[PDB]
Amino acid sequence: LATPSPFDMEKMVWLDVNILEIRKSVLENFGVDWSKQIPGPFAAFGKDFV
């Protein structure tokens, strides 16, 4: 004849979460940028024998 409870009282849990992030960066661009591919010498010949 005994009956159960409508529900059981559970235990409560507290959650504490921490997220930490640090970012650092450097960027350098120094100097002189010369050309590396340049035209060279040329030579041509032409003649009419007849």
Place this chain on the structure above:
Amino acid sequence: GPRNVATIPLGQDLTQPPVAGTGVRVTPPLGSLNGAIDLANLARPIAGTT
């Protein structure tokens, strides 16, 4: 250096004055210097080198 000579184009009238012609002459391609060095207005027999 190239030669500067007088020439008469083919198909032209025989009474017209001659025009400016040339011998063997080279206009080299400039790869990365294209647009930086002027070739249209450059006297071919080069006076002034630097």
